[PDB]
Design a protein around this ligand. Structure first.
Ligand SMILES: Nc1ncnc2c1ncn2[C@@H]1O[C@H](COP(=O)(O)OP(=O)(O)OP(=O)(O)O)[C@@H](O)[C@H]1O
Ligand SMILES: Nc1ncnc2c1ncn2[C@@H]1O[C@H](COP(=O)(O)OP(=O)(O)OP(=O)(O)O)[C@@H](O)[C@H]1O
Ligand SMILES: Nc1ncnc2c1ncn2[C@@H]1O[C@H](COP(=O)(O)OP(=O)(O)O)[C@@H](O)[C@H]1O
Ligand SMILES: [Mg+2]
Ligand SMILES: [Mg+2]
Ligand SMILES: [Mg+2]
Lengths: 523, 539, 478
C-alpha cells in the first residue's frame, strides 16, 4: 500500500501478452459502439458534475483562478470559489434552475468586476453591475475589480473633515468624520435606514452649495431588503433630487446568495472611484447583517465547516476587508475620501451576538438605536451613553464643538438621576433642576423623518438650549419651540455662522440678542 | 524540486510536492502572482501534500501554479536598520522609503527561552497614570495586559503608555499592530513622526520604534503571524543588542481570532465557543517568547479585546495567566465619564505585594480597594433606601469612595484632541500621598467633583477654588455684558458683508479625467485554446 | 513506522505493528511521542514537543515501554518538566527509579479512614474546612482570588512543621504547575528556596509553551512522584495547579485525534481522566505501610460558575471544596474563603482535637452571622441578639484574615480562635486593630503552646491557665 511499490508498478512486469494484444485490437471497435453516449472530453473548459441550491461543482476548468467569474453555457454567471483537486465549486450568480449536469462552463478570464465611473451616478444596480431601472445600459463607465485591498498606512491621512448627516443627535453627540466608518446598530424598526437616508438627503442639500470638491457622492447598498422597499427608496430619492449623486446597489431578497454577499463589494468598488479620484464618497451597507447570512448560505452549501451560529470562520474578514476600504486618502493620492455607514440589526437588543461584535470591533463609532427609546418619543432613538465615536472632536463643526460638549456632559448628568426619580425626594433643587434641563435637551434632540437640518441651524438650536432661552418652556413643546427659534430669528445669522464655522464673540452677542426677541409658545 | 498548487479554499492552499516536502512552518513562494504571495506551511496532509496559510489574498491562484520552497520560515529584517520603519508580516517596507537596510535577517519562529534563563527581578515601571501606579503597578520587564471590550479605551491607554514610557526609556520600542484599524496605525505613525520617536531621511538611525503592522484588511494568515514578526524584532533587540525593549501589541486577541479563522480549513474540529482546539498552546507559544532572559529585557504591553465585554470568553480567559500586570478596562466606569476606565477591583498586579512596592504603598492600595468594595456593596441598599440612614460611617465610606472614583480619573496627553483638557503626568509619590489623604480624611473639605479629571492632590485643591469662585459668580445680570451692541459689536448686516465669496459652477468635476471604455454587451469567454471568444450559441 | 501525516502536534503513523496504547514511541528527529489511539490503518501519535521537525515519511520507532517518570528521593528539590526530566540545570536525577505514570488507584481494602490531620497553616482552612491525610480537597475559585496562596501556604507550613516531628510523620510536597507561565514558576522556585521549602518539595512544571501531551501528562508524573512517598509509608501532598488547564490540553489532543466531543467540546472520558488521577490520593491501610497522599486540585471558575463541565466533574470527584470568592477578596477578607460554600466531607474526624472543640462554636456563629448579614448596613439597631452576633461575626471574620506566605502553627490558630469565641474579644472601639490581633499569641507565654501541641487538646487544666493568660494581655499602645 506504500507508494514506492506503487510507483515501482509503473515498470512493465506483465510476463504474458495474451490480453495486451487481444484488448488493443478490440477496444477501439467497442468505443465506437457507445460513442453516442460519450460526452466530449474537457480540459480547459468546464462541465457541471452536480448543481444544487446555487452551487455547481464543475469538472474541468484546469486553469481557472480562485475567485474568477466563470460563465455557464446558459448564460448565467458564476464564481470559482473553492478550487478542489478534482472539481471546482462555483457559486451561481442567479437562478440555478437553468444549469444541468453536463453543461459546459466557460472560464471568462477575469476576476469578478463591476462597472465603475460617473455613469453609475443616478442608476439602480443589482449586486453585479447590471442596471435594473430599465434606463438602458451603463455608459461612460469602466470595469474595476470588486476585491481591491484597502489603502494602507502611508496612503491615508487623519480624518478631519466633518461630513454632516443632518441628524442633530448624530451631528452633536456622535459626530462622523469624512473617512470614518460609523456603525448604525439597533433592533428592527428603530430607524437605522432612516438615519442613513437623512445622511444621503442632507448630502444632496449640501452638494448644491460647496465648490465642486467638497461634494459627497452617496452609494446605497441595499442587501437582503425586499424590492418594494428599494422602489420606495428610489422614489423618495428621485422626488427629493438626491438620486443625482446617489448610486443604488440592490441585491434584494429573491436574488441568489452570492449576489447579496457580493453587493457590498460591488457598491464599495463603485464608491471607491470617488475616493480614488479626489472626490468624496459615502456608502451605506444597509443590512450588513444580511450579507453575513448570504455568505453563511454560500459557505455551508460549499461544505465549509460552520462555527458560531454556523457562520464561517472568516466572517470577521468578510466585513473587515470591506470596511477598511472606507478611508481618507493622503494628498499624494488626491485627498479623496469614503465614509461608510454599515447597518447591523440586533435581535432583542442582544448586541453580544457574533456579527454584531465583529462589526462593532471593526468600525469606528456606533449609533445605537434602542427600541425602548423609540417608543418614548425619542426619535432618532439614539442611546447617548452607548453610542461612541472614535474621532470625537477635530472632525465636526467648530461652532457645534463650542456648544455640544456642554450638552454631552449635561445629558450624562441627566441620565445620572433617572435611577433616582422613582421616589420623589427631590434633593436640594439639583436632582430636580437637571431632571428638567436634560429632559429639555433630549426633547431638543428629537426630529422628524426625511427632513435633515443644516448644521448652522442645528448649532443655533442647541445653542438655544444648553445656554438659557428655554428653561421657562415646558418639556411638552420644545419641538414646537425650536421652529420658533429657527424661523423667527433673522436668517442672516445662519449665513455668517456657516461662513465663520465657529461662534465668534461678535456673533455670540447678536445670537444672544436675537434669542430673546422671538415668541416662545409655551403656556 | 518545486511544488504546485493543489487546492485553494479561501486563505488555505494545498501545495503538492513530488519529493522534497517542506518542513512545517516553512515559507513558500508562489511564482507568477500579481503580488508577493507567501504561503507558510501549516501541516503535512499526507500524500505528498502540505497545507499552507497565505500571507496575502489567494484570489488569482491557479491550480498547478508553481510554488517554490525557501527551505526556512518567514525571515524578516531585524536590527538597527528597522528602527523608524513600518514592516509587513514578511518584512516588506510599507512606508515607501527605500528597502530595509537591516543585517542578519531572522526567522519569525523560535522556541521560547528556557526555565534556566528566567529573570525574577521585580522593579516597578512608573507610568504616570495614577490608577495604574496605585492599584495595579506595572513591572519593568513584565507582561502587561490592557483588557477591555470595544470602545472602552485600550488604544488610548496604550497611546498614553507609549507617550509616557517609550519616549523616556532609552532602549528601543516595537509597536506590533495585530489586526487593528489602519486609521489608528496611520495616527500612530504620524504622531510618532511629530514626537521624534520616528525620524525620516538621513537621521533615520536616531529613531526609537519599529512599526510592524498586520491590520484588519489583511487576510487571516497575515494577522496570525505579524505578532511573531514584531516579537522577532524585539527578540533581536533583547538577545543580540542586549537592550531593554518595549513591545506594544495592539489586540493580541486578533492573533487568536486570526488563527481561528483558518482553523476549520486546516481540518480541525472546533473546540468550545468557536476557537481552535489549539487555543491555549498557540497563545502560550506566542506569549512565552515575550520574556526577559538574563541577556535583555522585554517589557510588553498588550491590548486584549474582550468580546462583548465578556471576560470569561476563552481568548481573554486564556491570556489572563500569561500576564504579570492586568489592567481591566470596563464599560461601567466609562459610562460615568471616568477615564481611564480601569476597574480598580478587577485589576491585579504581581507587584501589589508589601515586599515589592513597600508596605506604605500596599496599604493605601488595599485601603482604596476596601472602601471601593464597601461602596459597591452599599449601592444596592442606597438605591432602595436613599442614602440618609447610613449610620454616618457609611455616609463617610460613600463620600470617600465617591471622591476616590473621581480621583482615579486623569486627563491624558494623547486624549486632549477630543476632550480639550491637557494631560497630567502624575508621579508615584504624589499618587500615594494624594490617595492616602482622601483615604484618611484630609480632603473632606473639598467638593466631590473637584477630584474629577485632575493631576496631583495640589490640583483638586485649586479646582475647588476655581469652582467656588465660579459658583460665587454669575450673580450680576443687569447690563454691560457682551449682549450690548456699541461695546464692540458691528451691525448684523455688516457681518454678512465681510463673508468672502466661494463659487459654484454646477458641473461637480466629472468631465476631466475619465477613461470611459466601452464595456461588452455580450459575454466574452475563453475556449479550450484560451482565445477570447463570445459565449457560444447553445444552451 | 512511517509518518503519514503530521500537523498540530499529531502524527499519523503507518506501521508500528505491535504497539501498546499509551506506549512511548520515538521519531527520527529525536522527539518522542505517545501512541494514543491505535487504529487499523495508522497510529495516532501525540508528539512530546514541537512537531515541525517531523516530516511525512519520517521513521518512528517504538520504545517498547509505557510512559514512566523517575520517582524516588532524588526528585526532592528538583524542578522537572512534565515527563520527569529536570529543567533546573543541576544535572541528572541521581538516586531515583523509573516507574509508570498510569497506575491503578488503591482499592477498597487498601484504604484506611482519613483520621490524622493535615495542617495547611491557613487558619480559615484549619478551622472551618479541615483537611485530613488522604483527602482530596478542591481549591476552587475565580481568577486572582488566592488559590496558589492557599496551596503555597500548605507547602511552606509542611516545611515548618517537618522540622519538629519525627521521621515518620513528615509530609513531602509535590507542586504540579500545569499550563502556567514560565516566569511565574521561577518565582515559586525562588520563594520555595528562600523559604527552605525545596528540601521536601518536588516541582513538576509543564508550562504554556509546552506541548499539550506534556501538560496533560504532568499531573500523572507528579502523582507518581508523590506515590513514591505514599507507597513507602510516608506522607505526601500533591498540588495540581489548574487542573482546568490539564483538561484543556487533553481536549486539544482529543479533538485533534478526532475523538467525538461532548459538552464544551471535551471528550467523553474527561471525568475518567480526572477521577483516574484523583483517586490515587489515598490514606493507605496499615498493611501497605500506612502512608498517605493528600491532593489539592485547583480549578478556576469563570464567573463563579461552578456548574461548568470540568468544575462539576472535579466537585463530584473530590471530598471537600475550598471555595474562594472574589467579593470577599476585595472586601479585605484574604484568604477569601466562602465559609458557607466550602465543604469538607471528611469533616471534624480529621482536625486538631483542640481546634475541634473551639471551631464547632466558630462555624455555628459564623453561620448565624451569615444569615443576619443585611442588618450590618442598617442605622436602626435591632434587638441586640442580632447586634451581638453582628459584632461577633465581624470580629470573627477579621479573626480569620491572614497575610500571604506566613502560615501559622495549629496551636497558635487554636489560641487565637479561642480568644475570639470565648469572649476575650476586642470589644473596645477598634482603633487598636494594630496591636491586638497578634498581641494574643505574642503576649501569652509560649508554654501553653507547648502543652497544647503535645497534648493536642485544651484540657480543663489548660483552659484555666489559658483563660488566666488571656486576661493579662497588655496592648500598651492605647
Ligand atoms: N426620526 C424619526 N421620527 C419619526 N419616525 C421615524 C423616525 N425615524 C424612523 N421613523 C419610523 O420608524 C420606522 C422604522 O424606520 P426604519 O425603516 O428606518 O428602521 P429600520 O431599523 O431600518 O427597520 P427595518 O429593520 O425594518 O429595515 C419607519 O416606519 C419610520 O417611519
Ligand atoms: N492572604 C493573602 N493576603 C494578601 N495577599 C494575597 C493573599 N492571597 C493572595 N494574595 C495576593 O493576590 C494575588 C493573586 O493571588 P494568587 O496568585 O494566589 O491567586 P490565583 O487564584 O492563583 O491567581 P491565578 O489564577 O491568576 O494564578 C497575589 O498577588 C497575592 O499576592
Ligand atoms: N483617556 C480618555 N479620555 C477621554 N476619552 C477616552 C479616553 N480613553 C478612551 N476614550 C474614548 O473611548 C473611545 C474609544 O477608545 P479606544 O482607545 O479607541 O478604545 P478601543 O481600543 O477599545 O477601541 C474614544 O472615542 C475616546 O473618545
Ligand atoms: Mg433597514
Ligand atoms: Mg483599539
Ligand atoms: Mg494560580
Amino acid at each position: 500500500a506504500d507508494a514506492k511499490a506503487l510507483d515501482e508498478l509503473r515498470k512493465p512486469k506483465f510476463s504474458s501478452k495474451y490480453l495486451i494484444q487481444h484488448v488493443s485490437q478490440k477496444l477501439i471497435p467497442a468505443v465506437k459502439e457507445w460513442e453516442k453516449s460519450y460526452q466530449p472530453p474537457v480540459i480547459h473548459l468546464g462541465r457541471v458534475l452536480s448543481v444544487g441550491d446555487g452551487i455547481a461543482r464543475v469538472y474541468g476548468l484546469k486553469s481557472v483562478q480562485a475567485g474568477e467569474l466563470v460563465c455557464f453555457d446558459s448564460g448565467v454567471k458564476g464564481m470559482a470559489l473553492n478550487l478542489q483537486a478534482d472539481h471546482v465549486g462555483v457559486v451561481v450568480f442567479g437562478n440555478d434552475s437553468v444549469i444541468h449536469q453536463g453543461d459546459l462552463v466557460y472560464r471568462t478570464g477575469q476576476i469578478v468586476n463591476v462597472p465603475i465611473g460617473p455613469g453609475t451616478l443616478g442608476r439602480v444596480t443589482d449586486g453585479l453591475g447590471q442596471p435594473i431601472d430599465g434606463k438602458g445600459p451603463l455608459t461612460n463607465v469602466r470595469s474595476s475589480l470588486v476585491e481591491v485591498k484597502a489603502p494602507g498606512i502611508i496612503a491615508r491621512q487623519s480624518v478631519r473633515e466633518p461630513l454632516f448627516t443632518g441628524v442633530k443627535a448624530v451631528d452633536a453627540l456622535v459626530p462622523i468624520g469624512r473617512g470614518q466608518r460609523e456603525l448604525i446598530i439597533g433592533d428592527r424598526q428603530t430607524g437605522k435606514t432612516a438615519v442613513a437616508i437623512d445622511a444621503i438627503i442632507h448630502q444632496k442639500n449640501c452638494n448644491e452649495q460647496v465648490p465642486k470638491a467638497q461634494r459627497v457622492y452617496c452609494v446605497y447598498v441595499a442587501v437582503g431588503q425586499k424590492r418594494s422597499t428599494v422602489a420606495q427608496l428610489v422614489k423618495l430619492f428621485t422626488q427629493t433630487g438626491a438620486m443625482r449623486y446617489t448610486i443604488m446597489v440592490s441585491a434584494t431578497a429573491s436574488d441568489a446568495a452570492p449576489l447579496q454577499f457580493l453587493a457590498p463589494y460591488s457598491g464599495c468598488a463603485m464608491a471607491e472611484y470617488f475616493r480614488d479620484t479626489g472626490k468624496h464618497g459615502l456608502i451605506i451597507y444597509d443590512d450588513l447583517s444580511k450579507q453575513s447570512v448570504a455568505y453563511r448560505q454560500m459557505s455551508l452549501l460549499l461544505r465549509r465547516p460552520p462555527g458560531r451560529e454556523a457562520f464561517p470562520g472568516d466572517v470577521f474578514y468578510l466585513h473587515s476587508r470591506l470596511l477598511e476600504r472606507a478611508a481618507k486618502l493622503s494628498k499624494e493620492l488626491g485627498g479623496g475620501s469614503l465614509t461608510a455607514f454599515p447597518v447591523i440589526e440586533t435581535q432583542a437588543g442582544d448586541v453580544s451576538a457574533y456579527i454584531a461584535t465583529n462589526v462593532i470591533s471593526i468600525t469606528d463609532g456606533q449609533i445605537f438605536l434602542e427600541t425602548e427609546l423609540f417608543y418614548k418619543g425619542i426619535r432618532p432613538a439614539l442611546n447617548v451613553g452607548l453610542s461612541v465615536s472614535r474621532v470625537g472632536s477635530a472632525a465636526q463643526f467648530p461652532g457645534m464643538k463650542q456648544v455640544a460638549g456642554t450638552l454631552k456632559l449635561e445629558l450624562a448628568q441627566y441620565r445620572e438621576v433617572a435611577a433616582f426619580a422613582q421616589f420623589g425626594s427631590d434633593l436640594d433643587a439639583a436632582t430636580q433642576y437637571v431632571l428638567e434641563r436634560g429632559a429639555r435637551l433630549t426633547e431638543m434632540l428629537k426630529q422628524k423623518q426625511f427632513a435633515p437640518i443644516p448644521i448652522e441651524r442645528q448649532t443655533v438650536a442647541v445653542y438655544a438650549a444648553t445656554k438659557g432661552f428655554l428653561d421657562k418652556v415646558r418639556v411638552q413643546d420644545i419641538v414646537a419651540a425650536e421652529e420658533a427659534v429657527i424661523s423667527q430669528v433673522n436668517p442672516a445669522v445662519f449665513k455668517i455662522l456657516k461662513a465663520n464655522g465657529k461662534i465668534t464673540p461678535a456673533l455670540d452677542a447678536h445670537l444672544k440678542a436675537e434669542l430673546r426677541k422671538v415668541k416662545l409658545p409655551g403656556a | 524540486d518545486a511544488g504546485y498548487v493543489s487546492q485553494v479554499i479561501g486563505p488555505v492552499v494545498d501545495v503538492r510536492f513530488d519529493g522534497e516536502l517542506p518542513s512545517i512552518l516553512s515559507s513558500l513562494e508562489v511564482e507568477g502572482h500579481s503580488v508577493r504571495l507567501v504561503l507558510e506551511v501549516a501541516q503535512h496532509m499526507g500524500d505528498n501534500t502540505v497545507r499552507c496559510i497565505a500571507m496575502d489574498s489567494t484570489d488569482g491562484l491557479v491550480r498547478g501554479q508553481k510554488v517554490v520552497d525557501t527551505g526556512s520560515p518567514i525571515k524578516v529584517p531585524v536590527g538597527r536598520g528597522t528602527l523608524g520603519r513600518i514592516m509587513n508580516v514578511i518584512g516588506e517596507p510599507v512606508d515607501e522609503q527605500g528597502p530595509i537596510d537591516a543585517a542578519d535577517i531572522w526567522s519569525i519562529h523560535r522556541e521560547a527561552p528556557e526555565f534556566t534563563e528566567q529573570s525574577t527581578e521585580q522593579e516597578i515601571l512608573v507610568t504616570g497614570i495614577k490608577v495604574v501606579d496605585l492599584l495595579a503597578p506595572y513591572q519593568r520587564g513584565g507582561k502587561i495586559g490592557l483588557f477591555g471590550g470595544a470602545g472602552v479605551g485600550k488604544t488610548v491607554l496604550i497611546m498614553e503608555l507609549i507617550n509616557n514610557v517609550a519616549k523616556a526609556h532609552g532602549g528601543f520600542s516595537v509597536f506590533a499592530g495585530v489586526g487593528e484599524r489602519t486609521r489608528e496605525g496611520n495616527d500612530l505613525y504620524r504622531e510618532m513622526i511629530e514626537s521624534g520617536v520616528i525620524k525620516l531621511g538621513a537621521e533615520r538611525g536616531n529613531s526609537k520604534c519599529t512599526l510592524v503592522y498586520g491590520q484588519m484588511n489583511e487576510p487571516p494568515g497575515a494577522r496570525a503571524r505579524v505578532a511573531l514578526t514584531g516579537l522577532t524584532v524585539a527578540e533581536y533587540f533583547r538577545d543580540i543588542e542586549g537592550q531593554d525593549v518595549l513591545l506594544f501589541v495592539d489586540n493580541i486577541f486578533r492573533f487568536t481570532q486570526a488563527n481561528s479563522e483558518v482553523s476549520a480549513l486546516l481540518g480541525r474540529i472546533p473546540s468550545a465557543v468557536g476557537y481552535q482546539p489549539t487555543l491555549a498552546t498557540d497563545l502560550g507559544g506566542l506569549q512565552e517568547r515575550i520574556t526577559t532572559t538574563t541577556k535583555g529585557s522585554i517589557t510588553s504591553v498588550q491590548a486584549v479585546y474582550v468580546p462583548a465585554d465578556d471576560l470569561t470568553d476563552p481568548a481573554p480567559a486564556t491570556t489572563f495567566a500569561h500576564l504579570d500586570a492586568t489592567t481591566v478596562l470596563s464599560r461601567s466606569i466609562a459610562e460615568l465619564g471616568i477615564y481611564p476606565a480601569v476597574d480598580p477591583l478587577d485589576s491585579t498586579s504581581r507587584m501589589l505585594n508589601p515586599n515589592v512596592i513597600g508596605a506604605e504603598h500596599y496599604n493605601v492600595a488595599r485601603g482604596v480597594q476596601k472602601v471601593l468594595q464597601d461602596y459597591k456593596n452599599l449601592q444596592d441598599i442606597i438605591a432602595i433606601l436613599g442614602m440618609d440612614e447610613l449610620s454616618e460611617e457609611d455616609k463617610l465610606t460613600v463620600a470617600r469612595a465617591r471622591k476616590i472614583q473621581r480621583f482615579l480619573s486623569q486627563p491624558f496627553q494623547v486624549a486632549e484632541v477630543f476632550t480639550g483638557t491637557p494631560g497630567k503626568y502624575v508621579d508615584l509619590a504624589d499618587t500615594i500621598s494624594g490617595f492616602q489623604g482622601v483615604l484618611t480624611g484630609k480632603y473632606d473639605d473639598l467638593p466631590e467633583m473637584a477630584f474629577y479629571m485632575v493631576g496631583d492632590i495640589k490640583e483638586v485643591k485649586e479646582k475647588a477654588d476655581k469652582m467656588a469662585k465660579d459658583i460665587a459668580s454669575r450673580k450680576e445680570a443687569d447690563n454691560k455684558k457682551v449682549s450690548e451692541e456699541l461695546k464692540d459689536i458691528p451691525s448684523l448686516d455688516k457681518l454678512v458683508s465681510e463673508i468672502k465669496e466661494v463659487v459654484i459652477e454646477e458641473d461637480d468635476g466629472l468631465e476631466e479625467d475619465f477613461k470611459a471604455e466601452a464595456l461588452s454587451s455580450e459575454t466574452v469567454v475563453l475556449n479550450e485554446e484560451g482565445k477570447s471568444v463570445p459565449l457560444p450559441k447553445k444552451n
